[PDB]
Amino acid sequence: IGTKTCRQVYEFRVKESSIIAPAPAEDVDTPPRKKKRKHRLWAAHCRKIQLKKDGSSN
DNA sequence: CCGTCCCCCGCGTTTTAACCGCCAAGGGGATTACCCCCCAGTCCCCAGGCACGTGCCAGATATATACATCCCGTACGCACGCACATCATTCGAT
């Protein structure tokens, strides 16, 4: 927005930060990093589903 | 060669226990210092061992015979299949 310069907008966000509760700004990485996810397990996981009810195939 | 089947194997969970990293202690390897008692070395002396012959020995080496062993054929058993008669069952009239 070209109507306002960063100053008094940075300051407006200072006012906004004092009015509105601060944002969480949380970052995650998940416990899994790599490996332990072989696609044969997926096929095995698919095999588990296949034998359960996909055997009918209707 | 036929063909059998099971039993290792991949492959996948999940338990764990090696793995490291560090901490702690002193047992104990390694070293110095001393010294004596201990082996080398000489001299001397002598019987223990080897060389040489010797015979005798029994030790071996050959005989002959009794006996043991293996193998084939044999017959004998025997359970077998084949085959039968007979025990049994069926079709018809009673």
GROMACS .gro file of C-alpha atoms (C1' of nucleotides) in nm:
model
  152
    1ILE     CA    1   0.000   0.000   0.000
    2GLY     CA    2   0.152   0.329  -0.112
    3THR     CA    3  -0.069   0.546   0.107
    4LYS     CA    4   0.147   0.501   0.418
    5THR     CA    5   0.521   0.478   0.479
    6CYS     CA    6   0.667   0.199   0.694
    7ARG     CA    7   0.712   0.441   0.982
    8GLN     CA    8   0.381   0.506   1.158
    9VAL     CA    9   0.288   0.167   1.014
   10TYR     CA   10   0.562  -0.011   1.205
   11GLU     CA   11   0.447   0.221   1.483
   12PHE     CA   12   0.086   0.133   1.397
   13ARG     CA   13   0.178  -0.234   1.433
   14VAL     CA   14   0.335  -0.134   1.765
   15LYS     CA   15  -0.006   0.008   1.853
   16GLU     CA   16  -0.168  -0.299   1.698
   17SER     CA   17   0.063  -0.530   1.894
   18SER     CA   18  -0.035  -0.343   2.211
   19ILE     CA   19  -0.405  -0.371   2.121
   20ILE     CA   20  -0.431  -0.709   1.950
   21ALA     CA   21  -0.284  -1.013   2.122
   22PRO     CA   22   0.054  -1.118   1.977
   23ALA     CA   23   0.059  -1.380   1.703
   24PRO     CA   24   0.178  -1.732   1.793
   25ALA     CA   25   0.449  -1.756   1.523
   26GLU     CA   26   0.523  -2.120   1.608
   27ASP     CA   27   0.739  -2.347   1.392
   28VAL     CA   28   0.743  -2.727   1.388
   29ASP     CA   29   0.968  -3.003   1.253
   30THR     CA   30   0.771  -3.323   1.345
   31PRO     CA   31   0.940  -3.613   1.530
   32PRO     CA   32   1.008  -3.799   1.203
   33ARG     CA   33   1.304  -3.660   1.006
   34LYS     CA   34   1.371  -3.928   0.743
   35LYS     CA   35   1.360  -4.303   0.676
   36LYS     CA   36   1.121  -4.546   0.851
   37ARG     CA   37   0.867  -4.478   0.574
   38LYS     CA   38   0.937  -4.737   0.304
   39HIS     CA   39   0.673  -4.750   0.031
   40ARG     CA   40   0.648  -5.127   0.072
   41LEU     CA   41   0.485  -5.053   0.408
   42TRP     CA   42   0.241  -4.836   0.213
   43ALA     CA   43   0.177  -5.134  -0.014
   44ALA     CA   44   0.158  -5.345   0.301
   45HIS     CA   45  -0.077  -5.081   0.443
   46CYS     CA   46  -0.266  -5.101   0.115
   47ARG     CA   47  -0.251  -5.481   0.141
   48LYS     CA   48  -0.412  -5.456   0.484
   49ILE     CA   49  -0.695  -5.248   0.338
   50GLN     CA   50  -0.720  -5.472   0.030
   51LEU     CA   51  -0.776  -5.792   0.226
   52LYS     CA   52  -1.019  -5.625   0.467
   53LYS     CA   53  -1.289  -5.502   0.227
   54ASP     CA   54  -1.135  -5.431  -0.117
   55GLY     CA   55  -1.150  -5.804  -0.189
   56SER     CA   56  -1.510  -5.757  -0.301
   57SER     CA   57  -1.401  -5.501  -0.565
   58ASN     CA   58  -1.761  -5.383  -0.612
   59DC     C1'   59   1.586  -8.893  -1.364
   60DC     C1'   60   1.140  -8.785  -1.091
   61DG     C1'   61   0.957  -8.566  -0.767
   62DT     C1'   62   0.897  -8.496  -0.303
   63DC     C1'   63   0.835  -8.110   0.076
   64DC     C1'   64   1.019  -7.892   0.397
   65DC     C1'   65   1.303  -7.595   0.586
   66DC     C1'   66   1.592  -7.180   0.541
   67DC     C1'   67   1.544  -6.733   0.371
   68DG     C1'   68   1.396  -6.253   0.318
   69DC     C1'   69   1.152  -5.941   0.509
   70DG     C1'   70   0.929  -5.708   0.867
   71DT     C1'   71   0.857  -5.571   1.416
   72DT     C1'   72   1.056  -5.426   1.863
   73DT     C1'   73   1.374  -5.544   2.250
   74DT     C1'   74   1.784  -5.467   2.371
   75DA     C1'   75   2.205  -5.429   2.483
   76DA     C1'   76   2.646  -5.307   2.272
   77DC     C1'   77   2.835  -4.828   2.227
   78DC     C1'   78   3.027  -4.423   2.362
   79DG     C1'   79   3.164  -4.104   2.668
   80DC     C1'   80   3.298  -3.983   3.080
   81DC     C1'   81   3.436  -4.060   3.581
   82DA     C1'   82   3.720  -4.278   3.950
   83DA     C1'   83   4.121  -4.589   4.194
   84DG     C1'   84   4.471  -4.820   4.248
   85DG     C1'   85   4.637  -5.249   4.134
   86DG     C1'   86   5.022  -5.337   3.947
   87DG     C1'   87   5.344  -5.311   3.524
   88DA     C1'   88   5.768  -5.122   3.491
   89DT     C1'   89   6.184  -4.942   3.659
   90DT     C1'   90   6.622  -4.861   4.010
   91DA     C1'   91   6.903  -4.999   4.337
   92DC     C1'   92   7.189  -5.392   4.587
   93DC     C1'   93   7.413  -5.772   4.635
   94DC     C1'   94   7.517  -6.234   4.692
   95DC     C1'   95   7.518  -6.690   4.537
   96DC     C1'   96   7.584  -6.895   4.140
   97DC     C1'   97   7.728  -7.039   3.722
   98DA     C1'   98   8.167  -7.031   3.412
   99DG     C1'   99   8.608  -7.179   3.413
  100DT     C1'  100   9.070  -7.483   3.536
  101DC     C1'  101   9.291  -7.848   3.709
  102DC     C1'  102   9.284  -8.315   3.811
  103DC     C1'  103   9.148  -8.772   3.801
  104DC     C1'  104   8.868  -9.214   3.669
  105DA     C1'  105   8.492  -9.519   3.568
  106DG     C1'  106   8.129  -9.491   3.256
  107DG     C1'  107   8.056  -9.569   2.810
  108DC     C1'  108   8.159  -9.721   2.356
  109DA     C1'  109   8.394 -10.044   2.037
  110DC     C1'  110   8.474 -10.548   1.937
  111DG     C1'  111   8.371 -11.047   1.963
  112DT     C1'  112   8.121 -11.359   2.112
  113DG     C1'  113   7.820 -11.710   2.088
  114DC     C1'  114   7.451 -11.891   2.196
  115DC     C1'  115   7.017 -11.880   2.244
  116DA     C1'  116   6.577 -11.827   2.204
  117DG     C1'  117   6.408 -11.563   1.939
  118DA     C1'  118   6.286 -11.551   1.492
  119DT     C1'  119   6.197 -11.818   0.998
  120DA     C1'  120   5.989 -12.176   0.743
  121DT     C1'  121   5.668 -12.631   0.728
  122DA     C1'  122   5.173 -12.931   0.775
  123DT     C1'  123   4.705 -12.951   0.943
  124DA     C1'  124   4.253 -12.824   1.175
  125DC     C1'  125   3.935 -12.511   1.152
  126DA     C1'  126   3.673 -12.125   1.017
  127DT     C1'  127   3.441 -11.848   0.658
  128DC     C1'  128   3.200 -11.727   0.240
  129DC     C1'  129   2.899 -11.832  -0.113
  130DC     C1'  130   2.518 -12.105  -0.429
  131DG     C1'  131   2.227 -12.391  -0.456
  132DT     C1'  132   1.895 -12.585  -0.244
  133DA     C1'  133   1.461 -12.677  -0.052
  134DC     C1'  134   1.166 -12.544   0.240
  135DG     C1'  135   0.837 -12.229   0.414
  136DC     C1'  136   0.488 -11.916   0.307
  137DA     C1'  137   0.216 -11.592   0.186
  138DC     C1'  138   0.101 -11.482  -0.226
  139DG     C1'  139  -0.224 -11.461  -0.678
  140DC     C1'  140  -0.490 -11.737  -0.944
  141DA     C1'  141  -0.831 -12.034  -0.955
  142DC     C1'  142  -1.154 -12.314  -0.819
  143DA     C1'  143  -1.555 -12.544  -0.580
  144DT     C1'  144  -1.886 -12.443  -0.277
  145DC     C1'  145  -2.130 -12.134   0.023
  146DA     C1'  146  -2.433 -11.841  -0.070
  147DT     C1'  147  -2.797 -11.543  -0.315
  148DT     C1'  148  -3.114 -11.433  -0.663
  149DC     C1'  149  -3.494 -11.484  -1.029
  150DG     C1'  150  -3.896 -11.760  -1.112
  151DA     C1'  151  -4.269 -12.061  -0.954
  152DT     C1'  152  -4.452 -12.168  -0.610
   0.00000   0.00000   0.00000
